[PDB]
């Protein structure tokens, strides 16, 4: 059998500890969540009304919850055979990364995947599962970026409707030359708090993740 | 590819260290054939390989952080 | 920077008289009118500083301050911060003195256009007023450039005269 | 640099603005005056009622003006960049 | 063909590649009619483009339904005439997907 | 000619490269008519513009359907005349994709 | 020739390089007519340079269809006259892609 | 000459370098006519223009089609007269790319 | 020829490991890509909406896919003789740099290199395949940052048109103090996501780099 | 690229501006004109009594227009994005 | 050597209306490359006058330092300014004389620094001016039609970049800077 | 000359350096006419390929087409008169690129 | 002339190390005429030269990083 010595194993673990929170979290689950949060912040007609730290914390908690089944899968499939040294890191890493690869494959756009494969000049695949992570990652990022804005426009719509109707009703009576933005903000905030936009939106985006 | 090269380099480093360790274990087990002039040399070469690997790791992570922290 | 600020305000006030004062409503986003007619004079002023000396005259003041103030336990005198705070003052004083022709000429056009209401109450100043003012206001800028050439030198020496006395009369004020 | 060199730079900067904007400025007022006359002689209007034709009028003026307005800024900057080693001295 | 010539202000995106296929079918069947033994043909196409990086990519198909003239029958080499007449006039359609059928059942392909 | 004839304010992006292909087919078939033994030709092209998630384009195809004059038959070298007459007038169409068929079945290619 | 004279409000990017090619073909065929043995020519060009993520040249082709005068035949050196007459009047077209055909089949190239 | 006459709304830049080439060809052929043995010439140019940050040669060509006067033939040094008359009047055109052809085939170059 | 000792070979290799990841990536391969990505983010009307880390990662992956052929060529031509000890480091450097130099020269302009040669007072070159690395790099860099600006302007134009038309129609209907940007932003976003701006844009950029 | 291409790029881009806005601006302008001529024969008005008819006319105009407003936008940008490997050279 | 080039590049970047549109790494690399191209004659002369005796060990450092510093000071004297030199001489009570000769290091360096700062600002102003003209004209045309509240920044910036790329700004800019440094 | 008087709103940068070259050619040919043995000249210029450190810079050429008076012939030193008369009136044109031709063929250069 | 000078310096260092190595190799095989003190002194000089080279490299790379990490 073959494996890696303790020194190289801990070197690899420490090195991966650098990428893991920054990018393996930034470009995998909650980039669209923070994009939606920023779009909602812009739509509210106020810069940084919800603080950035609070938004990031809420997004982190939400993505932790969302990834719970995949976390349990990768735990029970890699850590348990590895925490009792019954498997080596070499294939343990692949076994752990397989469920996340499947999740990325499920949440991908076929057109983006095909374009990236053609750009990489590799078209021998017989099935969607046999794609490499190298070609899977950018397509996943692009699809997540697309769906982020797709949700964001729907978030935008109601505030736009409120602004248009309040401006029209305000200027129909001879008040054309006065900004209705200062007057639309209380109504938009009242509507949002009355409909409970936060709790409803969190469930909506969780269901979107569950497809 | 980068992943393939990294895997090959790490695997060869691990193989060198494992060979040195097993030779040292055979020597300390008393089995004749080891003259103490090979185990020490192989351990030193393995340490050199590990030092090269960690220096490459430091340089690579520094470069990655520098290119990733750029204000775009 | 008082010499800069007075120059900065003068350019802005010219812009506010034609189309740049629409931020009079609630606080907008970007000013929508700042770089239009401010940066033209916000950066021309520093050139006139370089015409005489950029840092040389300021440095010469620093050396003389050491002669006046030899660095010691002498407490800093009072009744001096207010005087330099009271200097501007000249921020709006010299600002309007440069603005004497532009302010009057633009307003006369504004008054002239309004007189046509008695002949036609539908003048539509949102249609005709803005285009008419812009061409004249822009034209006044090019032909009034030489008037600004010696005027900026006034503020430089006056602040220097203000600064020279403060740094020299303070040590004997103890 | 003499103070004349300082002020001479501000001249053509405003003159090109005077040259470039004038065709567009004149079109805006000329179209407005016609409607303002139409705003007389059975003066029924809402506020100005001239906004829609004015936007279209200057819009077509963009096609009419087109290149030589763009070409104005092209050579003036080249003249400015030609004297960069010479304005300092 | 005639449908292609027709112009409507409305241009549904999907009804673009369908109003066209309905014209191809009507054009392809106008030639098979001008072919001798055939009195009237009737072809449907089955163009599906949802295939990328899949083991089962699939392919386009057609189904001609010639109605031979009274007292006639297409020979063994007269079938490939009508197969290749359609296999080639349609993008990406091999001759193994074209289906020819008479007015008396009789799957010829 | 037909493309020149088909000039209008309406601008369908797809119907541009289709109103053109319908003119090529009608022009290519006007020359094969002026060719001696042929009385009337009828050509369809199969130019496939789409090239998404495909290792190769797979090229274009054509299917001429000449109707020879009464009592005539194209020789073995008179087939390549009509094959290259179409293989060359269409961009990227090899002569191995052109299909020639008489008015009596008889796939000639 | 007609395309340069032609003026329209529409400025379709494509129909620009197609209204031009249709004029080249009509100009090239007007000279081959003024060539002696030829009574009327008919040339089609095949310029195609589109490619995706590749450096492919995608070289052009032409297909002249001269109709010689009654009782005449182009000699062996009279073919290169009509080949180079077209190979040179078209950008990037080698003489190995020009196809010359009579009014009696007879691929001459 | 014609290019100065050819002024129109048309903002297309491509029809700028094409309305010009069509005038060069018509001017170059007006001189070869005023040359003695030639009764009427007909020249086409093949100038490829695009060339930015590349090493592509992009060399041009021409094809004169002189029609000599009744009972005349250009000598061996009268060919270089008409070759250099065109090779030099066109930017970047060597005399090895000019093609001269009579009204009786007979490629002279 | 003479060969450098291992003790100095490792020194020069580790030293090159400092410059090569930083500068040979910053000013050689994807400077235009990051510039046009920043310009597109500005043109979208919502600056800093996509995460900068996500944008940088996607740009790096696209860069690797773009330079895969030349990377493969230099990889074989350098490593394989070096791996089999066929060539020395000194000649290996030039042999590896030759295809990279060719690819770099393929994309640059002419006036830039002419001006740089005239400034450097180098003798005239009758053959283009003689530009030293001293003179090659600045010309390529300036050509890249010149083409990036025009590509970004071309990307900017449609969104500018949309904003202008929406502002014009709003003011024609009679809404003066209504910020068009807060209203057009959903429309710009919808246009982008519906025309698939990201995938099409990156594909077009890759094709432009190829040709 | 020569400055003519930018003018060409501007011309094609700006021509889209007129065509898209044309149905909306025309219906708004005629609506004021329709009221104005109908505001004879006891021309008495309050101030304008004309803005609200502009809403419904333009509102239905957008609805009847619908996709073709967006359909042009999809195609014009698609060509420009597809021509990016060609606008370079 | 090149404190002016980075300043003028920063001025151009700020005039473009977009912060850090080109990466700072690429700006510094271009500045360093242009600096070495400009200073190549002077650097070559310094290399000669220093190494040629020193490599073969013919002179001592106590004079080699002066021999290597003299050409650099001679080059820097042209870039310095007489007014700055006179003011620093007055500050440091040094002998003015009618003919300049071996200006001391305490005086020569600050004069060069301030002269370079002054000329850098002078070039930066002229670089900024065209963008200001474009902003002025676009703002004026926007205001004249009744669009006073539309932000011109999203409109001016594409025009600024289009002009900058269309006038081939980079090449002529660097050529002008090099020619100014030369003479 | 005449072109210089003409002025238009259009920014035709290319038609600027072409409306000028067409005037140079017409001015250069007006002097060669006022030269004695020449009855009428006809010169075309070939201003071309501006580049830097290329394998071949090529340079610009010209092609005079003098038409000598009835019963006359330019001597051996009367050729350099007309060569340098054009080589010098055109920027960067060596006398080795000027081509002189009579009205009877006869390349003189 | 900067890269040329650096390559010349590296060439001299590598040549000195190679000379030391070949002298030691010649000594250890029994060739007469080579002195143990001589070879030891040469090896020490080569080591000192290498240490000077690595010090210069460290100083130069630190200066480069410091001068190119700043923001303009």
Swiss-Prot record, chains B, M:
Localization (cell): Bacterial flagellum basal body
UniProtKB keywords: Bacterial flagellum
Keyword Transmembrane helix appears in the UniProt entry: no
Main location: other
GO cellular component, one term: bacterial-type flagellum basal body
GO molecular function terms attached to this record: cytoskeletal motor activity; structural molecule activity
Biological process terms in GO annotation: bacterial-type flagellum assembly; bacterial-type flagellum-dependent cell motility
Domain of life: Bacteria
Family: Belongs to the FliE family.
Protein name per the record: Flagellar hook-basal body complex protein FliE
Span within the parent record: 33 to 104 of 104
Swiss-Prot record, chain C:
Principal location listed in the UniProt entry: membrane
Residues included from the entire protein: 89 to 262 of 264
Highest rank taxon of the organism: Bacteria
Keywords carried by this UniProt record: Bacterial flagellum, Cell inner membrane, Cell membrane, Membrane, Transmembrane, Transmembrane helix
Functional note: Role in flagellar biosynthesis.
GO BP, one annotated term: bacterial-type flagellum assembly
Segments crossing the lipid bilayer: 43-63, 87-107, 125-145
Listed GO CC annotations: bacterial-type flagellum basal body; plasma membrane
Family affiliation: Belongs to the FliR/MopE/SpaR family.
Subcellular localization(s) per the UniProt record: Cell inner membrane; Bacterial flagellum basal body
Topological category with respect to the lipid bilayer: Multi-pass membrane protein
Organism: Salmonella typhimurium (strain LT2 / SGSC1412 / ATCC 700720)
Chloroplast listed as a keyword: no
Protein name: Flagellar biosynthetic protein FliR
UniProtKB/Swiss-Prot annotation, chains E, F, G, H, L:
Tree of life domain: Bacteria
Induction behaviour: Inhibited in nutrient-poor medium.
Cell compartments where the protein resides: Cell inner membrane; Bacterial flagellum basal body
Bridged cysteine pairs (disulfide): none
UniProt similarity note: Belongs to the FliF family.
Role summary: The M ring may be actively involved in energy transduction.
Subunit composition and interactions: The basal body constitutes a major portion of the flagellar organelle and consists of four rings (L,P,S, and M) mounted on a central rod. The M ring is integral to the inner membrane of the cell and may be connected to the flagellar rod via the S ring. The S (supramembrane ring) lies just distal to the M ring. The L and P rings lie in the outer membrane and the periplasmic space, respectively.
Protein name (database record): Flagellar M-ring protein
Source organism of this protein record: Salmonella typhimurium (strain LT2 / SGSC1412 / ATCC 700720)
Biological classification of the source: Bacteria, Pseudomonadati, Pseudomonadota, Gammaproteobacteria, Enterobacterales
Protein encoded by which gene: fliF
Residues shown, of full length: 113 to 221 of 560
From Swiss-Prot, chain K:
Main location per the UniProt record: membrane
Membrane topology (UniProt): Multi-pass membrane protein
One CC-aspect GO term: plasma membrane
Residues spanning the membrane: 26-46, 123-143, 147-167
Source organism, top-level taxon: Bacteria
Claim: Transmembrane is one of the keywords in the record: yes
Compartment(s): Cell inner membrane; Bacterial flagellum basal body
Record's keyword terms, sorted: Bacterial flagellum, Bacterial flagellum biogenesis, Bacterial flagellum protein export, Cell inner membrane, Cell membrane, Membrane, Protein transport, Signal, Transmembrane, Transmembrane helix, Transport
Biological process terms in GO annotation: bacterial-type flagellum assembly; bacterial-type flagellum-dependent swarming motility; protein secretion
Coiled-coil segments: none
Protein family according to the UniProt entry: Belongs to the FliP/MopC/SpaP family.
Further comment: For insertion of FliP into the membrane, cleavage of the signal peptide is important kinetically but not absolutely required.
Role description: Plays a role in the flagellum-specific transport system.
UniProt-recorded name of the protein: Flagellar biosynthetic protein FliP
UniProt gene name: fliP
